[PDB]
Curated annotation (Swiss-Prot), chain A:
Residue ranges annotated for the KIX domain, each copy included: 1-80
Name used for this protein in its record: Histone lysine acetyltransferase CREBBP
Subunit structure, interactors included: Part of a complex composed of MSX3, CREBBP/CBP AND EP300/p300; the interaction with MSX3 decreases histone acetylation activity. Interacts with DHX9 (via N-terminus); this interaction mediates association with RNA polymerase II holoenzyme and stimulates CREB-dependent transcriptional activation. Interacts (via transactivation domain and C-terminus) with PCNA; the interaction occurs on chromatin in UV-irradiated damaged cells. Found in a complex containing NCOA2; NCOA3; IKKA; IKKB and IKBKG. Probably part of a complex with HIF1A and EP300. The TAZ-type 1 domain interacts with HIF1A.
Function according to Swiss-Prot or TrEMBL: Acetylates histones, giving a specific tag for transcriptional activation. Mediates acetylation of histone H3 at 'Lys-18' and 'Lys-27' (H3K18ac and H3K27ac, respectively). Also acetylates non-histone proteins, like DDX21, FBL, IRF2, MAFG, NCOA3, POLR1E/PAF53 and FOXO1. Binds specifically to phosphorylated CREB and enhances its transcriptional activity toward cAMP-responsive genes. Acts as a coactivator of ALX1. Acts as a circadian transcriptional coactivator which enhances the activity of the circadian transcriptional activators: NPAS2-BMAL1 and CLOCK-BMAL1 heterodimers.
Species, as recorded: Mus musculus
Span of the entire protein shown here: 586 to 672 of 2441
Organism taxonomic ancestry: Eukaryota, Metazoa, Chordata, Craniata, Vertebrata
Amino acid sequence: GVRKGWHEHVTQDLRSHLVHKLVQAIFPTPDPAALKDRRMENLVAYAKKVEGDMYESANSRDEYYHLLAEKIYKIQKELEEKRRSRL
Amino acid sequence: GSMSHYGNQTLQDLLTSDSLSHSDGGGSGGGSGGGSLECDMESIIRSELMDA
C-alpha cells in the first residue's frame, strides 16, 4: 500500500464499522451473534478484502466510504429484490 | 462514490448515522425471519469472496 495522507483520517473504528455493515448487507443477520458464527470468518474475510480494496482505491476516507456505500447499497437491494420479487 | 441512481441517500444517511454519529456499533442485527435468505446471492458471493 502506498502512503496516502488521508489514511490517518480514518481509524480502525470507522473502517471496521463499515466492514461490519458490509457483512450486515451481504448477510441479513437475525442477531448480532450470527456475526460471530462460522459464516462470519468468511463474510468478514469478504468484507475485509472488499474494504481494503476500496480503502486503497480511494483518495479520501469519505470517498472510500462513498464508493463502498455504493457497492453495499446495490448488493442490498440486489439480494432483496431477487429473492423477494423477481423469482 | 458512484451513484448512477441518485437515490443513495437512504444508505449514505444510514452509514452517516451508524458509523459517524453513533461511531461504534459492531453488534447489530435485525433479520426478522432469519438470515439465510441470500441463497442464490451466495453464488455470486462465492465468486466475490474467492479472490482478494
